[PDB]
Structure formats: C-alpha cells, structure tokens
C-alpha cells in the first residue's frame, strides 16, 4: 500500500529471457502449427470460434516492440496459443498433440527460468 513496498524483484533480464524461451519454442520441431497466424480466409470456423488468435510470430513482434508490460502478460499470450489449439483441435490429431507437447515444453522452461 502507500509507502509500504515488498522488496524489489530484479526484472531487468526478463525481456532477454522471454526472448530466449520464445526462440526455443520457435525452433521446436512441433512448433509448426503455431509459427504464423492461422489464415482466417482459408480455415473455416476459425474467425468465428477463436475470439483472440495468437501465434509465435505475433508474440515475437509484440515482445520486440515493448508491447508486454511484464513477463505475465508474455506467459498469457503463449498460453493463449495452446488454449486456442485445444478449443479448435481434437487431442487425437497431430496438431492437438503438438499443442500438448509445446505447452508442456513452455511450462518447464518458465518454471526453470523464473520460479
């Protein structure tokens, strides 16, 4: 509250660290369904069903332009990618599996880097 602060967490390496994690996700072999925006002209249903599309290249642009105010708003955008994948794909499909694997991969890097 006013004039009463918790000790300051050093957050000065967060930008660099989210960028590393982002690169590791970009270079994972299962990243393919997620590298680019889902083409909304060519994928029936996506525009209407998925209210907030998100992809790695869009996250990259946002990171690179100071559009994340903090590391949590970064993690939400990455989770949103995998959440969309679940909403639109069956678990028993290559894409649906990729999303599970990529989420498991992200979540380990996030813990090990920050928790």
For the chain, which domains are there?
Answer: 1-115 (1.20.920.10)
Resolution limit, Å: 2.0
Q: Which residues contact 45 (CB under 8 A, 6 or more apart)?
A: 88
DSSP structural state of residue 16: H
Copy the structure tokens of residue 5. Answer: 């602060």
How many whole angstroms separate alpha carbon 80 and alpha carbon 86?
10
How many whole angstroms separate alpha carbon 17 and alpha carbon 54?
20
How many whole angstroms separate alpha carbon 107 and alpha carbon 102?
8
Method used experimentally: X-ray
Supply φ then ψ for residue 102, to 5 degrees.
-70, -35
Q: Which of 101, 51, 58, 48 minimizes the C-alpha distance to 78?
A: 58
């Amino acid at each position: 509250s006013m004039s009463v602060k918790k000790p300051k967490r050093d957050d000065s390496k967060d930008l660099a660290l989210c960028s590393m994690i982002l690169t590791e996700m970009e270079t994972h072999e299962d990243a393919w369904p997620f590298l680019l925006p889902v083409n909304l002209k060519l994928v029936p249903g996506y525009k209407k069903v998925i209210k907030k599309p998100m992809d790695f290249s869009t996250i990259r642009e946002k990171l690179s332009s100071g559009q994340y105010p903090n590391l949590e708003t970064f993690a939400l955008d990455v989770r949103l990618v995998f959440d969309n994948c679940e909403t639109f794909n069956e678990d028993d499909s290559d894409i649906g599996r990729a999303g599970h694997n990529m989420r498991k991969y992200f979540e380990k890097k996030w813990t090990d880097t920050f928790k």
